[PDB]
């Protein structure tokens, strides 16, 4: 599925991401825009053999098991295929574990480069939440 901006914002709010571990909702919407363009089926291969999956581009070296990544740690204890659902629940639950790991949202390259340091509240402007 490709989410709309405010549709995703509302889904993320329903799943408890607003202000989770200190990160307001606009951070999460901005991250998803630049990670996946709001597409639940996005995938990207990396040079270490890992792949990033889904709307929040969760990596198979650490977080989910795809059966093809050497060194896999599967800290979210989920198959990576579950992260390609149109329902964001599995991705959000894993993202909560990632942000709790102690490096915050810095796990998301596109957030660190393109969202951090901007007015991320603008990403939820005009939405009914
Ligand atoms: Cl998988
Ligand atoms: Na893995």
Swiss-Prot record:
Q: What is the lineage of its organism?
A: Eukaryota, Metazoa, Chordata, Craniata, Vertebrata
What would be the name of the gene that encodes this protein? Answer: LYZ
Name-wise, this protein is: Lysozyme C
Q: What are the disulphide bonds in this sequence? A: 6-127, 30-115, 64-80, 76-94
Q: What does this protein do?
A: Lysozymes have primarily a bacteriolytic function; those in tissues and body fluids are associated with the monocyte-macrophage system and enhance the activity of immunoagents. Has bacteriolytic activity against M.luteus.
Tell me the ranges covered by the C-type lysozyme domain, including all copies: 1-129
Top EC class, one word: hydrolase
**Which reactions appear under catalytic activity for this entry?**
Hydrolysis of (1->4)-beta-linkages between N-acetylmuramic acid and N-acetyl-D-glucosamine residues in a peptidoglycan and between N-acetyl-D-glucosamine residues in chitodextrins
Q: Which Pfam families does the record match to this protein?
A: Lys
């Amino acid at each position: 599925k490709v989410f709309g901006r405010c549709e995703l914002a509302a889904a993320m709010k329903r799943h408890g991401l607003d202000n989770y571990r200190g990160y307001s909702l606009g951070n999460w919407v901005c991250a998803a825009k630049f990670e996946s363009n709001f597409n639940t089926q996005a995938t990207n291969r990396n040079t270490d053999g890992s792949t990033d999956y889904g709307i929040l581009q969760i990596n198979s070296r650490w977080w989910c098991n795809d059966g093809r990544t050497p060194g896999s740690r599967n800290l979210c204890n989920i198959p990576c295929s579950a992260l390609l659902s149109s329902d964001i629940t599995a991705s959000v639950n894993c993202a909560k574990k990632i942000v709790s790991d102690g490096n915050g949202m810095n796990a998301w390259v596109a957030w660190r480069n393109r969202c951090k340091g901007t007015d991320v509240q603008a990403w939820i402007r005009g939405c009914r939440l």
